[PDB]
Amino acid sequence: SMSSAIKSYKSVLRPNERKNQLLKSTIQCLEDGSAFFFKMLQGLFGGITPEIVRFSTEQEKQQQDIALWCAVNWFRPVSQDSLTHTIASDNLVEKFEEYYGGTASDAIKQYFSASIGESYYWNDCRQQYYDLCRELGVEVSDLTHDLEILCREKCLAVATESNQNNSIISVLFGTGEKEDRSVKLRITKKILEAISNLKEIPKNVAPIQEIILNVAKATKETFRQVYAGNLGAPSTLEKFIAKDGQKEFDLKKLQTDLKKVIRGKSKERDWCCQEELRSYVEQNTIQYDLWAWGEMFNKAHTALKIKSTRNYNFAKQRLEQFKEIQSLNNLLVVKKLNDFFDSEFFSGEETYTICVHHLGGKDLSKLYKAWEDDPADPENAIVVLCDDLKNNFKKEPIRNILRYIFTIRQECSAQDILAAAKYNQQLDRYKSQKANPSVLGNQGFTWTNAVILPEKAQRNDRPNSLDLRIWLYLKLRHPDGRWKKHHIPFYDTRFFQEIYAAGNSPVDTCQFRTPRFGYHLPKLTDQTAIRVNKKHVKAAKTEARIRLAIQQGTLPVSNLKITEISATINSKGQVRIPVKFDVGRQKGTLQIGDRFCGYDQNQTASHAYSLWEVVKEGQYHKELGCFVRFISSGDIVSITENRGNQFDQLSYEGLAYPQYADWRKKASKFVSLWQITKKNKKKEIVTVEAKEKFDAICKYQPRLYKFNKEYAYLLRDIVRGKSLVELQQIRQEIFRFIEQDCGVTRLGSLSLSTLETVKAVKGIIYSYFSTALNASKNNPISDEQRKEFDPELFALLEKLELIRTRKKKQKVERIANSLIQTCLENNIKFIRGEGDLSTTNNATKKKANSRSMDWLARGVFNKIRQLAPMHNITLFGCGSLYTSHQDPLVHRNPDKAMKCRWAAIPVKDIGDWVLRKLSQNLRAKNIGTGEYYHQGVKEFLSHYELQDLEEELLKWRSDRKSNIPCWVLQNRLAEKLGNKEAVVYIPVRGGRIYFATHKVATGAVSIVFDQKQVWVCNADHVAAANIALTVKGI
RNA sequence: AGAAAUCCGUCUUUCAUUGACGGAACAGAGCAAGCAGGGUGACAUUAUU
DNA sequence: GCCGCTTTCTT
DNA sequence: AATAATGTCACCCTGCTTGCTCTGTTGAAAGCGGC
DNA sequence: ACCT
Ligand SMILES: [Mg+2]
Ligand SMILES: [Mg+2]
Ligand SMILES: [Mg+2]
């Protein structure tokens, strides 16, 4: 079938005063009718029955909890604006049972027992339904009968059966002739009859078309008139009659569609309360208008259905969580675990929830073993495990909690202790968990056929200024209630460029006139002569280029064949323009010649991509079950130029050290004048001269943006113990750093490091405000106070955060663009990406969590997911586990194959940290990836013939005076490699080098290491290859 | 149908009226975390009496 | 053919 | 032993800040009468 | 496990 995607444009409307008033009144009208339908539909959904739900969910393959669907429609947490019949949560269960005829299910119990925010209140929508029946002056059974018709006609969304657009307005309040349903039902039933018992199932549809025409007593030219009275969109049966006749016949499918029609049309639409309901709606809104009532209904109905569905799923989830909690609730082990706070191993003012990560997690087991194996030295076992654990990502255990656990290890096993910690976390999260309130929301309203078509646009073009206006033609409601259409303009140079400007190209047709869709605008020259206001130049430039393209006759004509464009408008005048377009036919599974890629997301280094082809002959891959060939690997990059020099906006690290001496000098003059205040001995004040820290920062010659982050921290430290006078002087320095020369307000790339730098600068200003206003636990400060004290610098807080927000949005867009453009250029139809990456969690260090917040792994994946189907490129998510260590084309071909990662360190640069890592890795044989790094250390010693060192290398702990020095390893390696500048391969986690069996990374070179031929590859390119080769779902 | 308008943004000790460039959007609810001060509380290294 | 309205469509 | 420097780790608070998921929307396709 |  033909796949499609959606692009869109967003601007603000510019109506004159009179039309602005009309638009304001029309939107207010639509909004008030929306609130009315919201309350009325809340009432009507309060009125559904178990048997309506049963009928709507009946063909569902998984059985639905009908009682729970009833519940999520009968009782809703709601806002004060729709609260009509307050119910205490106490009574929820009881009242539900009264309505349901039986005991409330456990999932329903979880839904009722869940928390709600303070501005929300439980509302009994079934009582609201009864009172609505009274207001309408109809019997309850009558309105319920009409509700059954509505839910059968798909006019309302019930459970898993979605609504049929806005059809409710036409079906219930429409003024026109309707279908002859009995005719369609008879014809459909006999057609299913006739095709039920065929003694020869034809391969083509011609005999079946014969049968249908004979039953319907019509010809191919009269079937529509006979069957549907020439009314409505063509049915499946009409289009079956329309088919060629040599086309193949799917008997199963025709029977399925005919059964659908018999099921949906067996009961007629005989309303009981139609005219009451129409009078009610019209009195509470405006005189009947299909479009306007449709918009009101759409807003209200969407708002209600999304929350009912979410609460259904949430209640099921909550029941599962509750059963998991009550399962591992070992009363005694939990109680003694928490008795840690009531024991003298804790002297804190307050307690806190004990979690798995506070215990070391699984490794608590190991610790118990130590205690079994060497009692009466428990402190050393604790210290050894803690040192072995320490990870730059995971949060370290609480030493006293482990100390107290030793006390009770005879009574409480390791597994029961970790079960108890898991129970603590799960119960806490279960208790704060909140049900979802039904609220109208602030969605806008859509006018259909609102944009004047580009080829019909009124254009007041000048020789040097194209008419840049796009006009909507909208029906608006006047004070007398009359609807009239008015022209309202808006500007969008991107919508102008991509679609709306009048193309004149003799030979070119494209979908969107922008580079990623294959079109580039002409270059501006010395003849361009742009003379506009300063605040329009960029827009002017785009206009100029389009003008040039029209003058050259090279502006492509849009091939989208747009016949109507709709516009969605809100109360603030903003307009949204959706454009749907076809992207090609749906792809089949991998053929030979199909190309696919994978991408690896990195933080400090570039995202990597790896490009592969399915081949007829070549290297076989089991998991793909095909032959594959490596095309190429690379770094994801987004270059822009400054007078010929290139910059990767994604990775640029700013000026090298020697190139910003002046800037550094200025910072230097400041720090020589100041000192850091510190008072954590007693209340006595300790002074250190800031230059000490500044020299330390400048010692290892960082590049510009790292330097700026480090200097931001320094400034914050300088600001900490000062007085107001001092702060006034310091305020002058803070402004110079932020605003001039190399400050984040003029320089900084889209790199993660730059975002962290801007965050550190915000930290400076935050510390300024905290110290100035004497902040404390008993004296919290607010934004009101901060703004009153120093409005300008408080404004800089928001400005810096907006800078970060804009950087991050632009960055996500640019990463997706670079990868998609790589795919288009290398004819890639499939992308694999890690859909698995961590966001943030209590078990992770706050520094790593903050970095991950600025990393935006999920956002990047979502953006690639958004852009890929716009070029018929499929994106698959895959689990990220072990993708950095698998050996490409060897792992799962046929067996599991993994290796450590390596770094290329010059021998002179081999410091005590290398020994730390080497020692740790060697004495680190364990489950998971440690085994591969222990193996890598083994191979390292073998290759460099340093095995004699292994022994003492294993006794290496940090700070031991009898540790082997760096000069030892450096001198052996320089003995063997000849000099001090030759590289040494070291196994280190996160290293950028992978020793691959195969040449699976562009630019790899083969060496022999530990008597093994192996390709020295970029580790992230290896990871991208691993991701590309994965087939398993996430 | 009313000549005005950066649609929204990015890079650069380069800030550009011919510099180089990028983007489907929107609503509500929910969840997860971060920071600046301030408190608590454990450990570890130095360097001494 | 267009506009503005109706209806049904099982995608 | 014991004091005090400097660093690590964690746990809490007030009042702000952020990213991510969920469940949805931005209709399709035909005829009619009046232009 | 990703992430260094
Ligand atoms: Mg990865
Ligand atoms: Mg700038
Ligand atoms: Mg990687």
Query: Which residue bears the tokens 């009124």?
Result: A458
Q: Which helix (H) or strand (E) holds A423?
A: helix A414-432
Q: Which amino acid is at A190?
A: K
Q: Which helix (H) or strand (E) holds A9?
A: strand A2-12
Contact A731, A793 (CB under 8 A): yes
Q: Is the peptide bond before A888 cis (omega within 30 degrees of 0)?
A: no
| Separation CA A827–CA A593 (nearest Å) | 10
How many residues appear in chain A? 1034
Q: Could you tell me the two tokens for A61?
A: 């393959």
| Separation CA A233–CA A641 (nearest Å) | 54
Residue A678 backbone phi and psi in degrees, to 5: -155, 130
CA–C1' A924–B27 (A) = 52
Pairing of strands A1005-1009, A1012-1018: antiparallel
3-state SS assignment for residue A395: coil
Q: Could you tell me the two tokens for A447?
A: 């006018």
Nearest to A992 by CA among A605, A598, A636: A605
Q: What is the rounded radius of gyration, in angstroms, for the C-alpha atoms of chain A?
A: 35
Q: Could you tell me the two tokens for A579?
A: 């454009």
Q: For residue A931, what are the CA distances in angstroms to A115, A885, A925, A935?
A: 46, 11, 5, 6
Residues whose CB is below 7 A of strand E: A 391-393, 600-605, 834, 836-838, 848, 852, 880-885, 928-929, 989-990, 1020, 1023
CA–C1' A544–D21 (A) = 43
| Separation CA A986–CA A876 (nearest Å) | 34
| Separation CA A859–CA A119 (nearest Å) | 31
Q: For residue A562, what are the contacts with CB-CB under 8 A and spacing of at least 6?
A: A453, A454, A499, A579
Resolution in angstroms comes to 2.6
Cα end-to-end span (Å), chain A:
26
Q: Is the CB of A580 under 7 A from strand D?
A: yes
From residues 837-866 of A, list those within 7 angstroms of strand D by Cβ: 839, 842, 845-846, 853-854, 856-859, 862
CA of A747 to the centre of ligand 2 (A): 7
Which technique? Answer: X-ray
The nucleotide whose C1' lies nearest the CA of A269 is C8
Contact A925, A919 (CB under 8 A): no
Tell me which ligand sits closest to the C-alpha of residue A744: 2
- H runs (alpha helix) in A328-363: 331-338
Question: CA quadruple A854, A858, A864, A866: dihedral positive or negative?
Answer: negative
Question: For every residue of A273-284, which 3-state class applies, written as one string?
Answer: CHHHHHHHHHHH
Contact A130, A138 (CB under 8 A): no
CA of A602 to the centre of ligand 1 (A): 6
Domain assignments of chain A as residue spans, ordered by start: 7-177+273-321, 182-265, 328-431, 447-566, 645-812, 902-989
Q: Could you tell me the two tokens for A911?
A: 């410091």
* Cβ-count burial A242-259 (b if 16+ within 10 Å, e if not): ebeeeeebeeeebeebbe
| Separation CA A744–CA A752 (nearest Å) | 13
